[PDB]
Every structure is written in structure tokens, then in C-alpha cells.
Amino acid sequence: LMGAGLSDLVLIGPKSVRLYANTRDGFAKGKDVVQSGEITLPVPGADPRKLVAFSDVLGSGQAHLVEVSATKVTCWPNLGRGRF
């Protein structure tokens, strides 16, 4: 989520994410990132009828948060540092 090529530790809630940056020897102090506007994020594992995963579906070179259901695919862009 830092966009550093490293895997950061994160917990996703619907309005915020708790992010611990990977500093390549351990992790950084966790930060709570509050999402802007009225953005609501999917929480993986929350609903058995849909897939929630981090993947690059825009082709930008960053994993984005993606929700796949029977009727649509919704992508929340990764703007870095836990911001969506």
C-alpha cells in the first residue's frame, strides 16, 4: 500500500485502514488512515457471495482493492499509504 514493492501489513475496515509500513527490517509504527468523502471499502471475508482481493485491474502497477460479484466488478484505486 506504500507503493514501495514491499508487502505492508494492513487491516481493512469499511471507513479506515490500519497500515504498518514495511521498512525492510521490521515494520513502521501503525497509522490509521481515514478514507475520504463517503468512500466505503469492502472488507475481505465479510460476504460469501463476493470476492474481495488486492489485485491490479487497472494496469497501473499497483494492487487495487477489488470487489467481484455476480453483477459487477468494483475497483477502489490505491493512492498510496492506505488511501483509496
Binding site: 487497472l58 494496469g59 497501473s60 502497477g61 499497483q62 484505486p77 493512492l79 498510496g80 488511501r83
Partner: protein, 84 residues
């Protein structure tokens, strides 16, 4: 008025056919590409939705030559067509 040479990048704003040269000064919209894409590594969406269709070179012949009046526009001396 102050420059002798112009290099112009056309994003689909003016005709690129073989029947008439394009004018230096034109109007109208550019063309929107189908493979529109975005990038997020700078913390914001940067989105590309057009592409250069032709590159064309103009000379301010009025300024360069002698006995020239009217200043009707830079005159195309050559162009490059790009098809995609």
C-alpha cells in the same frame, strides 16, 4: 509572432488525410483513445485518454523570407502520419 519555427503535436485535432495539408491554427476537439489508462504512483490519478496522431512542422515563412505580407499563419513544411 516571435518564433521562426514550430513543432506541433496533433492529438486528432485536425485532418491528417492526403488531400490537403493541416493548418497551423485549427479548432475542434481531439480524439479519445479506447485504451485509456491511469497511473497512481504520485498519490493521485493521472489519466491518459488521447494519443498523438500526427506530428507536423511549420515555418514562419513571413519572418524568414523577403517580400512576404499577410501573416496568414505558419506554413507546413512537412508532417508525419501515425496510424494505430
Amino acid at each position: 509572432a516571435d518564433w521562426l519555427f514550430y513543432l506541433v503535436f496533433d492529438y486528432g485535432e485536425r485532418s491528417n488525410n492526403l488531400k490537403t495539408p493541416p493548418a497551423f491554427s485549427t479548432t475542434g476537439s481531439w480524439l479519445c483513445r479506447q485504451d485509456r489508462f491511469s497511473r497512481y504512483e504520485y498519490g493521485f490519478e493521472i489519466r491518459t485518454r488521447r494519443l498523438c496522431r500526427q506530428v507536423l512542422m511549420y515555418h514562419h515563412l513571413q519572418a524568414l523570407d523577403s517580400k512576404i505580407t499577410e501573416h496568414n499563419g505558419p506554413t507546413l513544411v512537412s508532417r508525419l502520419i501515425l496510424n494505430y
